Structure 1
Amino acid sequence: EVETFAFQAEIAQLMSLIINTFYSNKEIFLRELISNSSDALDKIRYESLTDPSKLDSGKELHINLIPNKQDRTLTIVDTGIGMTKADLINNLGTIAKSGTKAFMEALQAGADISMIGQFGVGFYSAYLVAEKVTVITKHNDDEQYAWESSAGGSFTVRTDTGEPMGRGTKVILHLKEDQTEYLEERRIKEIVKKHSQFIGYPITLFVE
């Protein structure tokens, strides 16, 4: 059922830095995850140009933002290419080891945490606002898997028999108690407008 893995030392250090550093501009997490969704959406679009059957699992290319105040969750859903189990394990398809090295060298030369995505590890900025993150994903060449981590040096991977998606990625942010502003419609809309206004795919903000 549930497999447990250790984060590579560099990734664990990245996550601790993200968790323990004083850094007020937390809102950038949303731009980073929307950007990842957009990169995955680009990939399925590109593949479908030479093979339209890659879209049998879903033709609509889009991003949904789903706040749930009762569950204290902000969920980001895309219909991008999705990840294989192998991808999930290999730091969610990132070059996380080398990217972390460059990121921390940059923080040495006056970078700040908002620049995290320039190093291919924008995903981990989720830990600015979330105590636990769940990544549900479905790639055309594999089954649906759930990745999960509350940090602390380990993550899990299981097959997901919960709600089939067809194709793409769902990121569920179980928010820290003092970060509930990211569930407020007005705040989400402000953030999307500020940082994600030219994204090439529809972004739908769900109502509660």
Structure 2
Amino acid sequence: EVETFAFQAEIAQLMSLIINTFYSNKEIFLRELISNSSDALDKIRYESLTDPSKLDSGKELHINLIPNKQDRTLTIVDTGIGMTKADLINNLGTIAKSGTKAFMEALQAGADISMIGQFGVGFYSAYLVAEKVTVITKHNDDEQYAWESSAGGSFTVRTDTGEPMGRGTKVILHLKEDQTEYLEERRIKEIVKKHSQFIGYPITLFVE
């Protein structure tokens, strides 16, 4: 059932860097996850141009944002390309090892943490606000999997027998106790409008 894996050394460093650095502009985590969803949505769209059955697992191409104050989670769901087990283990389809290096040398030469997305590892900005991230994903070529990590140098992967999702990726942010502003409808709306207003897919902010 559950496999446990070590982050590679540079990804572990990136995560501590994100967790431990004093840096007040945390809201950018949402931009980077929406933009990740948008890239995933482009890929499956591009595939379907030549093969329409790629869309048998869901014709709709969207992003949903789902706050839940009970569980203290904010979930970003897309119906993009999704990830195979291999992708998930390989740093969630990112080039996280070289991207971290380029990111850390950009911090040397003047960059700040908000530019993380330019190095391909914007996913990890999730740890600006989450103490634990769960990613549920399904790619046409594989089963549904769940990846999880509370950082600390390791992550787990298991086949997911929760809710069948068809195709796509759910990023589930278990928010830190002091970052609950990102479950507030007005706050999420302000952030989407600020950093994500031209995303080319409909973004639905669910209500509670």
TM-score higher than 0.5: yes
Q: CA deviation at 1:68?
A: 0.1
Aligned mates of 1:62, 1:101 — CA distance in 2: 32
1:54-79 Cα deviation digits (max 9, x unpaired)? 00000000000000001000000000
Which residue in 2 is equivalent to 1:78?
Answer: 78
Name the % identity: 100
CA separation in 1, counterparts of 2:97 and 2:20? 20
Shift of 1:43: 0.2
Shift of 1:4: 0.1
String of CA shifts for 1:138-183, please: whole Å, max 9, x gaps: 0000000000000000000000000010000000000000000000
CA offsets per residue over residues 95-130 of structure 1, 9 Å max, x none? 000000000000001100000000000000000000
Aligned equivalents of 1:22, 1:164: Cα separation in 2: 39
Separation in 1 of the partners of 2:102 and 2:84? Answer: 26
Q: How far apart, CA to CA, are the structure 2 residues paired with 1:171 and 1:158?
A: 15
Counterpart position of 2:127 = 127
C-alpha separation in 1, matches of 2:178 and 2:70? 15
Deviation at 1:31, TM superposition (A): 0.2
Give me the CA root mean square deviation: 0.2
Q: Could you list the per-position Cα deviations for residues 18-72 of structure 1 after superposition, in whole angstroms to 9, with x for gaps in the alignment?
A: 0000000000000000000000000000000000000000000000000000100
- TM value normalised by structure 1: 1.00
Inter-partner Cα distance in structure 2 for 1:169 and 1:150:
18
For 1:45 and 1:118, the matched residues in 2 are separated by 22
Cα separation, 2, equivalents of 1:172 and 1:164: 16
Structure 2 CA distance for aligned equivalents of residues 159 and 53 of structure 1: 24
For 2:148 and 2:35, the matched residues in 1 are separated by: 20
Distance in 2 between the 1:199 and 1:11 partners?
28
Q: Give the Cα–Cα distance (whole angstroms) in 1 for the partners of residues 83 and 11 of structure 2.
A: 19
Instruction: State how far apart, in whole Å, the 2-side matches of 1:199 and 1:141 are.
Output: 27
Structure 1 residue 5 displacement after superposition: 0.1
**TM-score computed with the length of structure 2 as normaliser:** 1.00
1: CA distance, partners of 2:50 / 2:102: 35
Secondary structure in 1 matching 2:50: coil
SS, match of residue 173 in structure 1:
strand
* Aligned length in residues: 208
Shift of 1:191: 0.1
